DNA sequence: GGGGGAAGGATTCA
DNA sequence: CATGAATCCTTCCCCC
């Protein structure tokens, strides 16, 4: 099987460059302003110029400014980025029928049939990069390998603006020398649970009793790592199905007061409903981010679709359940809709 | 013993 | 300082 993975580089910041080309070469930082206080919030995405100095996604906006006070800071414009992304995906579509849109900036292409040899895939890659650079002025990195996981690792190794191929021989070297933490799906949490089992490389996963690895990180994650280490991972390329829609908003200040929280919750519902379009959910979940960044939620599934009126009423009940069962104050509040008809 | 929702939570990552 | 949604896991429940 030959999988070609496309990862748009520093996507949000790059789109801002395309929309304002005079930004090229300057450090650009796209942020999410929380409005709690001047520059309160986090970095969503930073381009290479800012990233090389430590300004990256996740750090506080105030922190970024101490490092690069002269960088260009812009508010995140998600729907603009989504529309540019949609145009890019439809373009990749013309190279494959078999396409898995993993996120706003990532897509896997099963080009097992339209090519053969890693020479022909590579060529299809350089071609794809040119097509996108030309039609949208967006540079992307391409990863090529025998399965989705290594195609992604390939991209991770080659970014930014690159193209890398991981043949069957380096897969085998990587299976022994690649830090397991760099394996897709292994975050800091899992990486630490693995470290305590001796596991630092994929190969190490085969020296452990399965039921032990399973007890430590779960059956699905255990089977996943094992199949990769055995050079047997082979999941098909398929775009997952949109299962839920919702929004969560950060309040100007933490609260525990119903009337103070409501306005934020209702705003979340309105935006959620606008995004659902013609979709009708049978389930609703009110989600709250506590003062200690802990996530709590209460939901309900109905035997029918949920009207906005029912959503407003049910959401208030769910929130009350939350405040009544948790003592912690609330920092962010929102809702999620699922089980579409 | 176990099929099969439903609910609440744990992780991942741009 | 702290900013959408899929997968997966655990517990719980109804009941054959
Ligand atoms: Ca990415
Ligand atoms: Ca990206
Ligand atoms: Ca990692």
Short mmCIF file of C-alpha atoms (C1' of nucleotides) and ligand atoms in Angstrom, two decimals:
data_model
loop_
_atom_site.label_atom_id
_atom_site.label_comp_id
_atom_site.label_asym_id
_atom_site.label_seq_id
_atom_site.Cartn_x
_atom_site.Cartn_y
_atom_site.Cartn_z
CA UNK A 1 0.00 0.00 0.00
CA UNK A 2 1.25 3.50 -0.72
CA UNK A 3 -0.04 6.36 1.41
CA UNK A 4 0.78 9.98 0.69
CA UNK A 5 0.19 12.37 3.59
CA UNK A 6 -0.24 16.13 3.19
CA UNK A 7 0.30 18.53 6.09
CA UNK A 8 -0.26 22.25 5.32
CA UNK A 9 2.59 24.21 6.98
CA UNK A 10 1.82 26.43 10.00
CA UNK A 11 -1.62 26.69 8.38
CA UNK A 12 -3.43 29.50 10.22
CA UNK A 13 -0.44 31.85 10.11
CA UNK A 14 0.26 31.00 6.47
CA UNK A 15 -3.32 31.82 5.47
CA UNK A 16 -2.90 35.21 7.16
CA UNK A 17 0.21 35.72 4.97
CA UNK A 18 -1.70 34.87 1.84
CA UNK A 19 -4.40 37.34 2.85
CA UNK A 20 -1.73 39.97 3.58
CA UNK A 21 1.48 39.10 1.67
CA UNK A 22 3.39 41.97 3.27
CA UNK A 23 3.63 39.69 6.32
CA UNK A 24 5.95 37.27 4.50
CA UNK A 25 9.28 36.90 6.28
CA UNK A 26 7.98 38.43 9.52
CA UNK A 27 7.11 36.42 12.61
CA UNK A 28 3.34 35.87 12.64
CA UNK A 29 1.44 34.61 15.68
CA UNK A 30 -2.25 33.66 15.42
CA UNK A 31 -3.92 33.84 18.82
CA UNK A 32 -7.17 33.21 20.63
CA UNK A 33 -7.88 36.22 22.85
CA UNK A 34 -9.90 35.15 25.90
CA UNK A 35 -10.77 38.70 26.94
CA UNK A 36 -10.11 38.01 30.63
CA UNK A 37 -7.42 40.72 30.61
CA UNK A 38 -5.17 42.56 28.14
CA UNK A 39 -3.58 39.92 25.90
CA UNK A 40 -5.05 37.09 27.95
CA UNK A 41 -5.21 33.94 25.85
CA UNK A 42 -3.04 31.45 24.00
CA UNK A 43 -1.14 31.05 20.75
CA UNK A 44 -3.07 28.87 18.29
CA UNK A 45 -0.37 28.82 15.58
CA UNK A 46 2.96 30.54 14.83
CA UNK A 47 4.92 30.51 11.58
CA UNK A 48 8.59 29.50 11.34
CA UNK A 49 9.96 32.97 11.99
CA UNK A 50 8.30 33.10 15.40
CA UNK A 51 8.59 29.40 16.19
CA UNK A 52 12.37 29.36 15.91
CA UNK A 53 12.51 31.64 18.98
CA UNK A 54 10.22 29.49 21.12
CA UNK A 55 6.87 31.05 20.26
CA UNK A 56 4.60 28.06 19.66
CA UNK A 57 1.01 26.89 19.97
CA UNK A 58 -0.21 26.54 23.54
CA UNK A 59 1.91 29.17 25.27
CA UNK A 60 0.20 32.25 26.75
CA UNK A 61 0.01 35.29 24.48
CA UNK A 62 1.73 37.39 27.20
CA UNK A 63 4.63 34.92 27.15
CA UNK A 64 4.99 35.18 23.38
CA UNK A 65 5.16 38.95 23.58
CA UNK A 66 8.03 38.88 26.09
CA UNK A 67 10.01 36.73 23.64
CA UNK A 68 9.07 38.58 20.44
CA UNK A 69 7.37 41.88 21.34
CA UNK A 70 7.68 43.03 17.71
CA UNK A 71 6.01 40.01 16.09
CA UNK A 72 2.69 40.36 14.25
CA UNK A 73 -0.14 39.13 16.51
CA UNK A 74 -3.49 38.35 14.88
CA UNK A 75 -6.84 37.01 16.12
CA UNK A 76 -7.76 33.53 14.90
CA UNK A 77 -10.23 33.61 11.97
CA UNK A 78 -11.33 29.96 11.87
CA UNK A 79 -14.00 30.09 9.15
CA UNK A 80 -11.64 31.86 6.77
CA UNK A 81 -9.07 29.09 7.33
CA UNK A 82 -11.76 26.42 6.93
CA UNK A 83 -12.83 27.75 3.54
CA UNK A 84 -9.25 27.90 2.26
CA UNK A 85 -8.75 24.37 3.58
CA UNK A 86 -11.89 23.09 1.85
CA UNK A 87 -10.57 24.39 -1.46
CA UNK A 88 -7.24 22.64 -0.91
CA UNK A 89 -8.90 19.32 0.02
CA UNK A 90 -11.08 19.33 -3.11
CA UNK A 91 -7.86 19.77 -5.06
CA UNK A 92 -6.20 16.77 -3.41
CA UNK A 93 -9.40 14.95 -4.30
CA UNK A 94 -8.32 14.99 -7.95
CA UNK A 95 -5.34 12.78 -7.12
CA UNK A 96 -7.36 10.26 -5.25
CA UNK A 97 -10.76 8.82 -4.72
CA UNK A 98 -9.38 7.33 -1.53
CA UNK A 99 -8.96 10.37 0.73
CA UNK A 100 -9.08 10.77 4.50
CA UNK A 101 -9.45 14.37 5.70
CA UNK A 102 -7.98 14.07 9.19
CA UNK A 103 -8.27 17.73 10.18
CA UNK A 104 -8.42 21.25 8.78
CA UNK A 105 -4.78 20.90 7.71
CA UNK A 106 -4.10 17.16 7.27
CA UNK A 107 -5.18 14.61 4.66
CA UNK A 108 -4.14 11.08 3.73
CA UNK A 109 -4.28 9.85 0.15
CA UNK A 110 -4.36 6.20 -0.80
CA UNK A 111 -2.46 6.37 -4.10
CA UNK A 112 -1.66 2.67 -4.05
CA UNK A 113 -3.16 2.27 -7.47
CA UNK A 114 -2.40 5.58 -9.32
CA UNK A 115 1.37 4.93 -8.91
CA UNK A 116 3.81 2.14 -8.03
CA UNK A 117 7.36 2.41 -6.81
CA UNK A 118 8.23 5.19 -4.37
CA UNK A 119 9.61 7.05 -7.39
CA UNK A 120 6.20 7.55 -8.90
CA UNK A 121 4.64 8.45 -5.55
CA UNK A 122 7.38 10.97 -4.83
CA UNK A 123 6.69 12.54 -8.23
CA UNK A 124 2.99 12.72 -7.48
CA UNK A 125 4.05 14.48 -4.30
CA UNK A 126 6.17 17.19 -5.89
CA UNK A 127 3.31 17.64 -8.35
CA UNK A 128 0.77 18.05 -5.55
CA UNK A 129 2.99 20.56 -3.76
CA UNK A 130 3.25 22.63 -6.95
CA UNK A 131 -0.49 22.48 -7.59
CA UNK A 132 -1.29 23.83 -4.11
CA UNK A 133 1.48 26.43 -4.06
CA UNK A 134 0.22 27.68 -7.42
CA UNK A 135 -3.53 27.75 -6.86
CA UNK A 136 -3.55 28.86 -3.22
CA UNK A 137 -0.03 30.09 -2.48
CA UNK A 138 0.11 27.68 0.45
CA UNK A 139 3.20 25.54 1.04
CA UNK A 140 2.70 22.03 2.42
CA UNK A 141 4.89 19.12 3.53
CA UNK A 142 4.40 15.67 2.04
CA UNK A 143 5.09 12.34 3.72
CA UNK A 144 5.14 9.02 1.87
CA UNK A 145 5.26 5.46 3.21
CA UNK A 146 3.60 2.07 3.54
CA UNK A 147 0.90 3.15 5.99
CA UNK A 148 -0.73 6.26 7.43
CA UNK A 149 1.37 6.37 10.58
CA UNK A 150 4.74 6.37 8.86
CA UNK A 151 3.51 8.69 6.11
CA UNK A 152 2.78 11.17 8.92
CA UNK A 153 6.10 10.57 10.65
CA UNK A 154 7.70 11.21 7.27
CA UNK A 155 5.95 14.58 7.10
CA UNK A 156 6.89 15.36 10.69
CA UNK A 157 10.53 14.78 9.83
CA UNK A 158 10.44 16.85 6.64
CA UNK A 159 8.38 19.88 7.71
CA UNK A 160 8.33 22.67 6.79
CA UNK A 161 7.86 22.83 3.00
CA UNK A 162 9.28 19.39 2.30
CA UNK A 163 8.69 15.91 0.96
CA UNK A 164 10.03 12.74 2.55
CA UNK A 165 9.77 9.06 1.79
CA UNK A 166 10.17 6.34 4.37
CA UNK A 167 10.89 3.11 2.52
CA UNK A 168 10.42 -0.35 4.04
CA UNK A 169 14.04 -0.22 5.21
CA UNK A 170 13.90 2.95 7.30
CA UNK A 171 10.57 1.83 8.79
CA UNK A 172 12.56 -1.02 10.24
CA UNK A 173 15.28 1.31 11.52
CA UNK A 174 12.70 3.74 12.92
CA UNK A 175 10.87 0.86 14.57
CA UNK A 176 14.07 0.53 16.63
CA UNK A 177 15.48 4.04 16.87
CA UNK A 178 12.47 6.37 16.78
CA UNK A 179 11.46 7.72 20.18
CA UNK A 180 8.04 6.18 20.75
CA UNK A 181 6.92 9.62 21.91
CA UNK A 182 7.21 10.78 18.30
CA UNK A 183 4.73 8.14 17.20
CA UNK A 184 1.39 9.75 16.25
CA UNK A 185 -1.20 9.32 18.99
CA UNK A 186 1.35 9.17 21.78
CA UNK A 187 1.05 12.34 23.85
CA UNK A 188 3.03 13.28 26.96
CA UNK A 189 0.65 11.28 29.13
CA UNK A 190 1.01 8.04 27.19
CA UNK A 191 4.72 8.66 26.66
CA UNK A 192 5.19 8.74 30.43
CA UNK A 193 3.12 5.63 31.08
CA UNK A 194 5.27 3.90 28.47
CA UNK A 195 8.54 5.20 29.94
CA UNK A 196 7.64 3.47 33.20
CA UNK A 197 7.30 0.13 31.40
CA UNK A 198 10.77 0.40 29.93
CA UNK A 199 9.36 1.35 26.52
CA UNK A 200 11.25 4.18 24.78
CA UNK A 201 11.15 2.80 21.23
CA UNK A 202 8.51 0.92 19.27
CA UNK A 203 10.56 -2.26 19.33
CA UNK A 204 10.43 -2.27 23.13
CA UNK A 205 6.68 -2.95 22.95
CA UNK A 206 7.25 -6.54 21.85
CA UNK A 207 9.27 -7.42 24.98
CA UNK A 208 6.32 -6.81 27.26
CA UNK A 209 3.47 -9.12 28.15
CA UNK A 210 0.43 -7.85 26.23
CA UNK A 211 -1.91 -7.90 29.23
CA UNK A 212 0.57 -5.68 31.04
CA UNK A 213 0.82 -3.09 28.26
CA UNK A 214 -2.96 -3.24 27.94
CA UNK A 215 -3.49 -2.62 31.63
CA UNK A 216 -1.14 0.33 31.43
CA UNK A 217 -2.31 2.13 28.27
CA UNK A 218 -5.46 0.35 27.17
CA UNK A 219 -6.15 -2.46 24.72
CA UNK A 220 -6.63 -0.28 21.62
CA UNK A 221 -3.44 1.71 22.14
CA UNK A 222 -1.53 -1.50 22.98
CA UNK A 223 -2.63 -3.30 19.82
CA UNK A 224 -1.84 -0.14 17.87
CA UNK A 225 1.76 0.15 19.04
CA UNK A 226 2.33 -3.61 18.68
CA UNK A 227 1.11 -3.80 15.08
CA UNK A 228 3.37 -0.88 14.22
CA UNK A 229 6.42 -2.50 15.83
CA UNK A 230 5.65 -5.76 14.02
CA UNK A 231 5.47 -3.82 10.75
CA UNK A 232 1.84 -4.93 10.43
CA UNK A 233 -0.12 -1.68 10.95
CA UNK A 234 -2.35 -1.35 7.90
CA UNK A 235 -5.44 0.76 8.59
CA UNK A 236 -7.36 1.84 5.47
CA UNK A 237 -7.69 5.44 4.36
CA UNK A 238 -11.17 6.74 5.06
CA UNK A 239 -12.50 10.13 6.14
CA UNK A 240 -14.20 9.74 9.50
CA UNK A 241 -17.81 10.87 9.90
CA UNK A 242 -18.83 14.06 11.68
CA UNK A 243 -20.35 12.69 14.91
CA UNK A 244 -20.91 15.88 16.91
CA UNK A 245 -21.05 19.68 16.76
CA UNK A 246 -20.65 22.20 19.56
CA UNK A 247 -18.85 25.15 21.11
CA UNK A 248 -17.32 26.18 24.41
CA UNK A 249 -16.47 29.73 25.44
CA UNK A 250 -14.18 31.19 28.09
CA UNK A 251 -15.98 33.53 30.49
CA UNK A 252 -14.50 36.92 31.36
CA UNK A 253 -14.11 35.54 34.89
CA UNK A 254 -14.66 32.25 36.73
CA UNK A 255 -18.12 31.81 38.20
CA UNK A 256 -20.52 29.52 39.99
CA UNK A 257 -23.55 31.72 39.50
CA UNK A 258 -26.29 30.45 37.18
CA UNK A 259 -27.47 33.81 35.84
CA UNK A 260 -23.89 34.90 35.29
CA UNK A 261 -23.02 31.75 33.33
CA UNK A 262 -26.22 31.48 31.26
CA UNK A 263 -25.44 34.24 28.71
CA UNK A 264 -22.28 32.35 27.76
CA UNK A 265 -24.09 29.01 27.56
CA UNK A 266 -26.87 30.40 25.35
CA UNK A 267 -24.32 32.00 23.07
CA UNK A 268 -22.69 28.59 22.78
CA UNK A 269 -26.05 27.06 21.88
CA UNK A 270 -26.79 29.67 19.19
CA UNK A 271 -23.43 29.18 17.48
CA UNK A 272 -23.76 25.40 17.77
CA UNK A 273 -27.22 25.44 16.17
CA UNK A 274 -26.01 27.70 13.38
CA UNK A 275 -23.24 25.17 12.66
CA UNK A 276 -25.49 22.09 12.76
CA UNK A 277 -27.23 23.38 9.64
CA UNK A 278 -29.91 20.88 8.66
CA UNK A 279 -28.58 18.33 11.16
CA UNK A 280 -30.87 17.37 14.04
CA UNK A 281 -29.26 16.05 17.22
CA UNK A 282 -30.91 13.65 19.66
CA UNK A 283 -28.25 14.24 22.31
CA UNK A 284 -27.00 17.33 24.12
CA UNK A 285 -24.10 17.72 26.55
CA UNK A 286 -23.26 20.79 28.58
CA UNK A 287 -19.49 20.88 29.05
CA UNK A 288 -17.65 22.91 31.67
CA UNK A 289 -13.96 23.68 32.07
CA UNK A 290 -13.32 24.17 35.80
CA UNK A 291 -10.89 26.66 37.33
CA UNK A 292 -8.25 23.94 37.39
CA UNK A 293 -8.68 23.19 33.67
CA UNK A 294 -10.56 20.01 34.57
CA UNK A 295 -13.38 19.06 32.17
CA UNK A 296 -16.81 18.04 33.59
CA UNK A 297 -20.04 17.35 31.68
CA UNK A 298 -23.65 16.30 31.97
CA UNK A 299 -25.74 15.26 29.01
CA UNK A 300 -28.97 13.67 27.90
CA UNK A 301 -30.15 11.65 24.94
CA UNK A 302 -33.73 12.09 23.72
CA UNK A 303 -35.80 9.63 21.66
CA UNK A 304 -36.31 12.45 19.14
CA UNK A 305 -34.56 15.49 17.67
CA UNK A 306 -33.84 18.47 19.93
CA UNK A 307 -35.48 21.82 19.10
CA UNK A 308 -33.67 25.00 20.12
CA UNK A 309 -36.29 25.58 22.82
CA UNK A 310 -35.66 22.10 24.25
CA UNK A 311 -31.91 22.75 24.04
CA UNK A 312 -32.19 26.00 26.06
CA UNK A 313 -34.28 24.36 28.74
CA UNK A 314 -32.32 21.11 28.97
CA UNK A 315 -28.97 22.92 28.97
CA UNK A 316 -29.98 24.93 32.08
CA UNK A 317 -30.89 21.70 33.89
CA UNK A 318 -27.58 20.09 32.93
CA UNK A 319 -25.62 23.14 34.09
CA UNK A 320 -27.46 23.08 37.43
CA UNK A 321 -26.59 19.42 37.81
CA UNK A 322 -22.94 20.40 37.24
CA UNK A 323 -22.90 23.24 39.78
CA UNK A 324 -24.78 20.96 42.21
CA UNK A 325 -22.40 18.02 41.86
CA UNK A 326 -19.15 19.97 41.57
CA UNK A 327 -17.98 22.72 43.96
CA UNK A 328 -15.24 24.07 41.72
CA UNK A 329 -15.79 27.36 39.88
CA UNK A 330 -16.26 27.40 36.11
CA UNK A 331 -13.81 28.99 33.68
CA UNK A 332 -15.21 27.86 30.31
CA UNK A 333 -18.76 26.75 29.50
CA UNK A 334 -20.34 25.27 26.39
CA UNK A 335 -22.41 22.57 24.74
CA UNK A 336 -22.03 19.65 22.36
CA UNK A 337 -24.73 18.08 20.14
CA UNK A 338 -24.65 14.51 18.81
CA UNK A 339 -26.57 11.44 17.62
CA UNK A 340 -27.85 13.19 14.50
CA UNK A 341 -30.98 11.88 12.79
"C1'" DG B 1 -22.00 -14.32 31.46
"C1'" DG B 2 -22.73 -10.86 28.35
"C1'" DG B 3 -25.23 -7.91 24.40
"C1'" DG B 4 -25.79 -3.07 23.98
"C1'" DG B 5 -26.97 1.65 25.03
"C1'" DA B 6 -26.03 5.61 27.89
"C1'" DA B 7 -23.24 8.63 30.80
"C1'" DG B 8 -18.99 10.72 32.46
"C1'" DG B 9 -14.36 11.08 31.74
"C1'" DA B 10 -9.32 10.58 29.60
"C1'" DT B 11 -6.22 11.79 25.50
"C1'" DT B 12 -4.71 13.65 21.49
"C1'" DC B 13 -3.47 17.67 18.85
"C1'" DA B 14 -3.47 23.15 15.57
"C1'" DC C 1 -0.84 31.56 31.97
"C1'" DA C 2 -4.36 28.17 30.63
"C1'" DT C 3 -7.82 28.18 23.80
"C1'" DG C 4 -13.30 21.33 18.15
"C1'" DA C 5 -14.15 16.73 18.10
"C1'" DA C 6 -12.78 11.74 17.12
"C1'" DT C 7 -11.30 7.69 19.61
"C1'" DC C 8 -11.23 5.19 23.47
"C1'" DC C 9 -12.05 3.61 28.51
"C1'" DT C 10 -14.85 2.66 32.80
"C1'" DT C 11 -18.90 2.18 35.12
"C1'" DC C 12 -23.63 1.39 35.31
"C1'" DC C 13 -27.97 -0.42 34.08
"C1'" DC C 14 -31.70 -3.43 31.99
"C1'" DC C 15 -32.48 -8.04 31.15
"C1'" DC C 16 -32.12 -12.34 28.44
CA1 LIG D 1 -0.74 19.28 11.45
CA1 LIG D 2 -0.22 22.75 10.18
CA1 LIG D 3 4.45 13.19 20.75
#
